[PDB]
Design a binder for this molecule. Structure first.
Ligand code: BCL
Ligand code: BCL
Ligand code: BCL
Ligand code: BCL
Ligand code: BCL
Ligand code: BCL
Ligand code: BCL
Ligand code: CLA
Ligand code: CLA
Ligand code: SF4
Ligand code: SF4
Lengths: 61, 122, 61, 359, 119, 123, 61, 61
């Protein structure tokens, strides 16, 4: 329905479709790794910006 | 208690008959339903005959049938802990741990104390 | 409708920022009180999703 | 950060010369009470029955059933108040005070005198509806408490000893009579409590047991704000008591909030306003000034509905704040100006809300 | 009437008090102190709190392990147990109001008075 | 306008890191109240076998009860501490004699239901 | 088959979520009755449910 | 048509053993109490005469 996958007898459509699913799988691997990282610091209250040395406050931000 | 309505959904969405426990069996009037009520479709089976028909395809599959055996094996074991026999298993576990200590000492020179555990009712 | 809903929610999200609901105040005190009302609510939501995906998935569209 | 309070009000009035009105009030508030002990619950009952029309005497009863921090507290009063003259009013009554396992009864013979510093004709002529009247009240008290308990005797012995050894007993008794926040309320309503005067503290034998007897007399002055002084004639519609009148109320309070229920009929709800026009009685000032004392601690949102029901043929000439909607003879107040006036008077404001209904 | 299960203890139907000590004064009067099941305040059986007992607002009980119960409770308790761990049994005797004598304990089909009952 | 040494207070929106964001008492079973569930018995240390069982009839008819042996009890208050008892039989006597049936008792209240003149819960 | 696998999944889960909301909710109703906060709640969501006579009427129907 | 009636009856009898073999005896005792009160309440309101039944529950043994 979203166009990532296609019902096509042609092997070319089946090969092109596979590249799209592989791309969405790698993308979800990257975004998932960010959410896990953003889920470790929140859990350990170690919510410090690595670029700007200053940390943040949960109650007031 | 929710397994009944949770099964009236499984049966109803698979085109099964729920108005009778026996629909479509080779018996007196089970196959007379489609014309007595003038139904445009023909339901797979009735509450009881559902198990016979739906499982012809399960037995043909070597993996769908492994689930039938594993799923049944898991289910009956619930009776062992759900039945009011918690005390019996405990005295039984005592004989278990006593017998192991006895066998280990008589055969080997070591002492085998495992203290077989038993779950609580809750 | 992904944009119509984004407009309804944003407008609804500002009204509750200025006028937070006082219904079920006792929940604000304990986490499990609020977590349980959310779970009683999410379940009826999931049953509703199950019932519309049956009517819709076999529509002509 | 704002909490919500919901309330409903209702006044039903009869026609003719009748001053009879039915008042119902329900309220629900989500902020903690100022009481330093919680939970504190309380039910109050008042009933007035006319004894005889010519004498003007009436029998008034009061029951207080309050549980304070799991401590049952009960006060009961039965009295016979009647009008002697324009400024004097004698009451004869009996009552009981019980706290937990402790209880003691009392009998009183008392008279209250009320005088206005001035009485001028020009004020009456030029001011159609005066609010402030400056005055003072004098109470004659003859208390009769039997010393049944070991503790009563000790409270009496101690009292006599204190009077005997302390010259400043008339002054420092006002620090005891008004305990905790009650002392602060005096200055707040512009009310001055004068020093008590002990006519006599004599033990007189009774058939049951020794009876400590106190004969005291005190006074208190109102700058005009006090309703007992400013409105002495209006708070006792004895002559308008054709049938018995009852006011029943109660409230539940704890850390979470307050729940209040009030209902009852009594005369004096409607008073003549001049030019053939009737009007709801002016709001008592002392309750508002006394509630501003505890109502200013939590920012709140007001949800109040005031349903007023008038007699057949009787239609409002004027109201501010104006009624939101109307339903034939019934008129409704909610929202807008009215839920500003409620926010005003729940925090201690005394702003006027006047309804004039003529036939 | 009666308070709900949520108000106070849920198990109780009426508030519950236990006579905790029964020492006597110089004149030999029995000073009875009863504390409630919650147990944070000390009271004596005044008429106002007896008056609750007439209407069943409260109920009063005595433990059989009381240091000064006067009567030889253990021997009698041990006998009944033997009739139908025996030592360490403890019971709660329900104190009742007798208009003629005040608080009495119907122990073994024989009415008693708190002063007669206690040391 | 001079001032005193600064107070280091970083509570609101600040780039600074926030912080992590004896045989005195005696115990007894009231035997008439006990239902013999034995929840108390399992809180007693096994090397101090104070609580025990006492049989005199069929269990389905309250034929069994629990009791503390005071000769071996060490007043560790484990049975009382955990609010196990459902009947109030397990009680505690303080060194000065008060009898506690439960470790904390909710405060007493009046009871009335609040209705409204014109809202959904009318009358 | 696919339409029955998705519809049933969100229905069994929905039912399971509702049961747990009531469980974890009554798990909190126990904590308050024990601490006595039950009589202190002002919400119509608990107040209208603390009368034993009203309970046996609801359950009775 | 008769060997299948046995199949139905025999299965119906067997699962009912779960009701008396599961550790729900305390639950049945409470439930019945609600039923007795509920039936008493229904009879009371519905008929001037009040009739009660005191529904019974089996013991574990
Ligand atoms: C609160 C403001 C005034 C006050 C106002 C009045 C008024 C007004 C009068 C009395 C008069 C009396 N006062 Mg005074 N009195 C006060 C302080 C005291 C104190 C004290 C503890 O310091 C004492 C011992 C007394 C003693 C007395 C009695 C001798 C006498 C009758 C009381 C009675 O029957 O109450 C009954 C017992 C109760 C608990 C009633 C409480 C009523 C409350 C205050 C208002 C309820 C009415 C409600 C708003 C509308 C109800 C309508 C229904 C039909 C009832 N007063 C303060 C200083 N007093 C009366 C008199 O003149 O006697 C000759 C009388 O008319
Ligand atoms: C299965 C039937 C019930 C159920 C019955 C129970 C029971 C019984 C218990 C809990 C308990 C918990 N439940 Mg619950 N609970 C259910 C649904 C949920 C859902 C949900 C997915 O919607 C959530 C978020 C929770 C949340 C939680 C936590 C508040 C708490 C501790 C979790 C834990 O340590 O698990 C274990 C942690 C793991 C890593 C194991 C894997 C768990 C996975 C992640 C699923 C979580 C939910 C699951 C039911 C947790 C319990 C598993 C036990 C084997 C029963 N429940 C349904 C409605 N729940 C406990 C508690 O303290 O309650 C007051 C408890 O005793
Ligand atoms: C946040 C703002 C909130 C609010 C915040 C609070 C808070 C906070 C509290 C209250 C309190 C009260 N509120 Mg408010 N309240 C709000 C709006 C309302 C509304 C409404 C919507 O219409 C109502 C009906 C009420 C009603 C009430 C009462 C239940 C209560 C005061 C009782 C009283 O009169 O004592 C009358 C008291 C006396 C008469 C004094 C008694 C003691 C003294 C020593 C007696 C001396 C007098 C003398 C003896 C008298 C005469 C004797 C006779 C003549 C014989 N509130 C607003 C919306 N309210 C207070 C309370 O008490 O709660 C429990 C409190 O702490
Ligand atoms: C001067 C300012 C006020 C005033 C201030 C005072 C003061 C101050 C007192 C009185 C007092 C009294 N006043 Mg003056 N008085 C005023 C004018 C008057 C007028 C009038 C016709 O205007 C009248 C009838 C009175 C009447 C009275 C009496 C009821 C009382 C003293 C009589 C008594 O006890 O013997 N006042 C003016 C306008 N009045 C006394 C009193 O106790 O009143 C209760 C008192 O001490
Ligand atoms: C915002 C509030 C309103 C207001 C609200 C109310 C309300 C509400 C009511 C009154 C009532 C009164 N009003 Mg008005 N009133 C206002 C403005 C005025 C003005 C004016 C020229 O501004 C005057 C003369 C008055 C007059 C009066 C009195 C007739 C009456 C109070 C009776 C009394 O005992 O007072 C006599 C005088 C005093 C008590 C104090 C004496 C005057 C002051 C204290 C001293 C004046 C000194 C002056 C500067 C002269 C120079 C001094 C030299 C040394 C000689 N008001 C303001 C604008 N007024 C009441 C009433 O109608 O009852 C019958 C009442 O309920
Ligand atoms: C001894 C006490 C006094 C007394 C003192 C007062 C005082 C003081 C006031 C009134 C008020 C009123 N009185 Mg009066 N009153 C008494 C006896 C009577 C008699 C009679 C003799 O038959 C009559 C006709 C009335 C009638 C009335 C109304 C005209 C008016 C209330 C309006 C209303 O309905 O508000 C609807 C609202 C309610 C009914 C709420 C009632 C709430 C609870 C039940 C009472 C709270 C009082 C106080 C805050 C808390 C209790 C203290 C007690 C010590 C326990 N009272 C006796 C003689 N009465 C007020 C007024 O403005 O009068 C002109 C007023 O301020
Ligand atoms: C829309 C409702 C939400 C929800 C919102 C809440 C809120 C909010 C709360 C609860 C809380 C509770 N809920 Mg939940 N909860 C949901 C799902 C459920 C279901 C279910 C039907 O499967 C159940 C059995 C429960 C059970 C419970 C308990 C676990 C818990 C405490 C009992 C209680 O609230 O008594 C209260 C019951 C009453 C007071 C009696 C009924 C009150 C009135 C009558 C209900 C309005 C009906 C109205 C008149 C409509 C009638 C239709 C006609 C046209 C008139 N929840 C659904 C999805 N739940 C309470 C809590 O603290 O949880 C931690 C609480 O505050
Ligand atoms: C397959 C099911 C199963 C099995 C293996 C057992 C086994 C046992 N039961 Mg149980 N029981 C069951 C079902 C089962 N029961 C049910 C349904 C009920 C309800 C009626 C009971 C009620 C019950 C009571 C009341 C008591 C026991 C007791 C016992 C033990 C005494 C027998 C013994 O010493 O060796 C028997 C021989 C063996 C166990 C050989 C092993 C057999 C296989 C190889 C076990 C491994 C297979 C297993 C299913 C793997 C699981 C896979 C997973 C995917 C589920 C024994 C461990 C008694 C006891 O002492 O409790 C501790 C006792 O008092 N039984
Ligand atoms: C067909 C099986 C069946 C039936 C009819 C019931 C019925 C009932 N159960 Mg039970 N239960 C069952 C199976 C069953 N249960 C199983 C398998 C378990 C184990 C999980 C339980 C566990 C259990 C518990 C733990 C509790 C109950 C409770 C209840 C009662 C509350 C519901 C109510 O008031 O009306 C429900 C509606 C009806 C009963 C309508 C009647 C339905 C049919 C017409 C009944 C007649 C058919 C019957 C099978 C005829 C027998 C024929 C014979 C040849 C065998 C109700 C009488 C509760 C209670 O209050 O106990 C008293 C309770 O606490 N159930
Ligand atoms: S105090 Fe400790 S040893 Fe004594 S009975 Fe209680 S749990 Fe057992
Ligand atoms: S926990 Fe309570 S009911 Fe259970 S054995 Fe102990 S005293 Fe008896």
């Amino acid at each position: 329905s979203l166009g990532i996958d296609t019902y096509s007898t042609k092997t070319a459509d089946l090969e092109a479709a596979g590249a799209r699913l592989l791309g969405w799988a790698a993308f979800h691997f990257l975004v998932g790794s960010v959410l896990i990282f953003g889920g470790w610091r929140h859990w350990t209250h170690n919510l410090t910006n690595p670029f700007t040395g200053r940390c943040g406050n949960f109650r007031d931000f | 208690w929710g397994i009944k309505g949770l099964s009236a959904v499984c049966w109803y969405i698979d085109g099964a008959w729920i108005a009778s426990m026996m629909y479509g069996v080779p018996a007196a009037d089970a196959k007379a339903w489609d014309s007595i009520a003038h139904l445009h479709h023909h339901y797979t089976s009735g509450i009881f005959y559902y198990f016979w028909t739906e499982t012809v395809t399960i037995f043909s599959s070597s993996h769908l049938s492994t689930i039938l055996m594993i799923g049944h094996l898991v289910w009956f074991i619930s009776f062992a802990v759900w039945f009011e026999d918690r005390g019996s298993r405990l005295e039984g576990a005592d004989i278990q741990t006593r017998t192991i200590r006895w066998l280990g000492k008589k055969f080997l020179n070591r002492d085998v104390n495992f203290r077989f555990p038993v779950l609580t009712i809750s | 409708m992904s944009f119509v809903f984004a407009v309804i929610f944003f407008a609804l999200g500002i009204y509750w920022w200025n006028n937070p609901p006082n219904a079920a105040i006792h929940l604000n005190d304990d986490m499990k009180a609020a977590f349980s009302v959310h779970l009683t609510a999410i379940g009826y939501i999931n049953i509703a999703l199950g019932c519309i995906a049956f009517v819709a998935f076999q529509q002509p569209s | 950060d704002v909490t919500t309070a919901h309330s409903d009000y209702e006044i039903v009035l009869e026609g003719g010369s009748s001053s009879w009105g039915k008042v119902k009030a329900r309220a629900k508030v989500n902020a903690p009470p100022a009481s330093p002990l919680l939970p504190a619950d309380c039910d109050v009952k008042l009933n007035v029955k006319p004894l005889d029309p010519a004498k003007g005497f009436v029998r008034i009863s009061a029951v207080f059933e309050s549980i304070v921090d799991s401590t049952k507290n009960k006060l009961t009063i039965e009295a016979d108040i009647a009008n002697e003259t324009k400024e004097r009013r004698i009451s004869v009554g009996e009552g009981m005070v019980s706290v937990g396992d402790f209880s003691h009864t009392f009998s009183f013979e008392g008279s209250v005198v009320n005088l206005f510093y001035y009485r001028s004709d020009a004020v009456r002529r030029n001011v159609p509806n005066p609010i402030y009247m400056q005055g003072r009240q004098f109470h004659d008290i003859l208390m009769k408490v039997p010393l049944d308990n070991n503790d009563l005797i000790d409270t009496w012995e101690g009292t006599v000893k204190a009077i005997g050894s302390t010259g400043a007993f008339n002054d420092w008794i006002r620090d005891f009579w008004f305990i905790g926040p009650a002392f602060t309320a005096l200055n707040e309503g512009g009310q001055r409590i004068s020093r008590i005067e002990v006519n006599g503290l004599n033990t007189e034998s009774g058939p049951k047991g020794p009876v400590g007897v106190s004969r005291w007399r005190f006074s208190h002055g109102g700058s005009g704000m006090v309703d007992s002084i400013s409105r002495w004639a209006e708070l006792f519609p004895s002559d308008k008591l054709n049938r018995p009148a009852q006011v029943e109320a109660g409230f539940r309070s704890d850390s979470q909030g307050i729940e209040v229920k009030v209902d009852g009929e009594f005369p004096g709800v409607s008073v003549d306003a001049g030019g053939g026009l009737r009007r709801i009685l002016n709001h008592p000032l002392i309750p508002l000034v006394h509630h501003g004392m505890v109502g200013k601690f939590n920012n709140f949102n007001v949800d109040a509905q005031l349903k007023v029901v008038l007699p057949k043929g009787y239609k409002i000439r004027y109201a501010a704040p104006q009624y939101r909607s109307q339903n034939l003879e019934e008129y409704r107040w909610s929202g807008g100006a009215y839920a500003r006036w409620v926010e005003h008077v729940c925090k201690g404001g005394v702003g006027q809300f006047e309804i004039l209904y003529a036939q | 009437a009666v308070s709900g299960p949520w108000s106070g203890n849920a198990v109780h139907k009426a508030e519950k008090y236990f006579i905790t000590s029964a020492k006597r004064d110089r004149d030999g009067k029995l000073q009875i102190e009863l504390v409630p099941a919650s147990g944070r305040r000390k009271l004596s059986p005044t008429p106002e709190m007896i008056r609750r007992l007439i209407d069943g607002e409260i109920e009063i009980y005595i433990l059989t392990t009381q240091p000064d119960i006067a009567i030889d409770m253990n021997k009698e308790i041990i006998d009944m147990e033997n009739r139908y761990g025996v030592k360490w049994t403890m019971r709660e005797i329900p104190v009742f109001y007798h208009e003629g004598k005040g608080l009495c304990v119907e122990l073994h089909n024989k009415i008693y008075t708190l002063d007669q009952f206690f040391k | 306008k001079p001032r005193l040494a600064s107070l280091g207070v970083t509570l609101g929106r600040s780039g600074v890191r926030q912080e992590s964001a004896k045989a005195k008492k005696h115990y007894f079973i009231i035997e008439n109240l006990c239902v013999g569930c034995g929840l108390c018995l399992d809180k007693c240390p096994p090397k101090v076998n104070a609580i025990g069982y006492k049989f005199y009839g069929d269990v389905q008819e309250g034929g069994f009860r629990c009791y503390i042996d005071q000769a071996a009890c060490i007043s560790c208050s484990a049975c009382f501490s955990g609010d196990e008892c459902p009947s109030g039989a397990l009680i505690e006597v303080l060194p000065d004699g008060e009898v506690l049936d439960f470790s904390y008792t909710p405060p007493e209240r009046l009871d009335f239901d609040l209705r409204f003149l014109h809202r959904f819960h009318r009358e | 088959v696919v339409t029955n696998l998705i519809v049933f999944n969100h229905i069994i889960c929905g039912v399971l979520y509702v049961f747990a909301g009531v469980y974890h909710g009554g798990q909190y109703l126990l904590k308050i009755q024990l601490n006595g906060m039950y009589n202190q709640i002002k919400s119509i969501w608990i107040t209208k449910g603390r009368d034993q006579e009203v309970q046996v009427k609801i359950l009775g129907t």
